Write a protein that binds this ligand. Structure first.
Ligand SMILES: O=c1cc(O)n([C@@H]2O[C@H](COP(=O)(O)O)[C@@H](O)[C@H]2O)c(=O)[nH]1
Ligand SMILES: O=c1cc(O)n([C@@H]2O[C@H](COP(=O)(O)O)[C@@H](O)[C@H]2O)c(=O)[nH]1
Lengths: 218, 219
């Protein structure tokens, strides 16, 4: 996956007008948008097709899929029917649940991203202790795309070590949650940025500034 | 706690509005509580909750297995309750802050959180099972009153009931298609969740009536 400026916009505004306007304001800087449940549950799954119509961007559906295999299959099918290029799936529920997602993605020409450790403090309670094993499970299953935490660069580096340089790794928690863009890109192929851009007085300037700060890395 | 008719909750995971509405209508006399998840919501929109309320006046549990950071969890809960869901199901494995975020929104908005503590499918044994007792204990510490646990593992369901106490409310999926037995599950759960055994039946009403007949002495 070729992400423009190594920067993925997390579009978690919950109003269609604002989401479209802000995305339009930063369109020159990105070609990949992560759309999650805050926007989808507020404005409907048709928003994905609208983003493709307006911007042509690739769309990663951040749905943190975390059900039994049978339900995971249905979620992925509905998501890809809506036009998502990729979907983010939790690894914690185990291998069969991940495989269900991989199957549908293969059938519809899409990608699965495996979330292995999360960026927020609560991640330390249960997820962090399982994260290396979840990453190895990903490797065993043939997963090629991964998500890990900007807020813990030593953990992000370990994830990169496990999956290898050939795998694709994206990382949230940059800006608002404390992660640094440049440090994160030592290990991740692309950074995910939400509030630092979409809550900024001037989203375009916010995006431009981030890109300026990592310009030697592009 | 919510008063679930016949101790039976329909898992409405059909993905077509017409079929979902038809089947739910057919079992309306047996069930007043419907679990709606992402298969139906991602196919038909959040307005499906509105449509079910209008047509059936059933309680709605939004099975969204909320599993994000606290800030995003808050946004998901707000949108879900705004649409009319009575309750939302939240994963515990992302930790206490993520659960608290959902609890805080539910309190502010006058709705309920159900905490999913162990799952019923085989993959649950890899990571979730080992964390489940602690996730449940965390729920109790956070003041969670409603829980979800697996019918497919009676020993695990029994332990979860012990941890949360007799006053907490416990619902349990995996009955029927996944192998769980209705009566045995109700030894520990307040209500059973049933999807395919009902909604894929030639006669969903007869399927529901049959399950209820089998647990008649427990009602
Ligand atoms: O560990 C994770 C995994 C995520 O997907 N995310 C997601 O990444 C985005 C981060 O947004 P922000 O830059 O506003 O903090 C949110 O959409 C959030 O749900 C995260 O923050 N941490
Ligand atoms: O551990 C769990 C937790 C669930 O919510 N579920 C949900 O309960 C329902 C089970 O449906 P069924 O009776 O068709 O197997 C599905 O909606 C599924 O997503 C489950 O099967 N196992």
């Amino acid at each position: 996956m070729d992400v423009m400026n190594r920067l993925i916009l997390a579009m978690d505004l919950m109003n269609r007008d604002d989401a479209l306007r802000v995305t339009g304001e930063v369109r020159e800087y990105i070609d990949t948008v992560k759309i999650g449940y805050p926007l989808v549950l507020s404005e409907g799954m048709d928003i994905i097709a609208e983003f493709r119509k307006r911007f042509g961007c690739r769309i990663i559906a951040d749905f943190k899929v975390a059900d039994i295999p049978e339900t995971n299959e249905k979620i992925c099918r509905a998501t890809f029917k809506a036009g998502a290029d990729a979907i983010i799936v939790h690894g914690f529920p185990g291998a069969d649940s991940v495989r269900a997602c991989l199957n549908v993605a293969e059938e519809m020409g899409r990608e699965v991203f495996l979330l292995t450790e999360m960026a927020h403090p609560g991640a330390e309670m249960f997820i962090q202790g399982a994260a290396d094993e979840i990453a190895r499970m990903g490797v065993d299953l043939g997963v090629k795309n991964y998500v890990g935490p900007s807020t813990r660069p030593e953990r992000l580096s370990r994830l990169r070590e496990i999956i290898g340089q050939d795998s694709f790794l994206i990382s949230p928690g940059v800006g608002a949650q404390g992660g640094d863009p440049g440090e994160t890109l030592r290990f991740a192929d692309a950074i995910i940025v939400g509030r630092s851009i979409y809550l900024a007085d001037n989203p375009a300037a916010a995006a431009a500034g981030i890109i300026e700060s990592i310009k030697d890395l592009l």
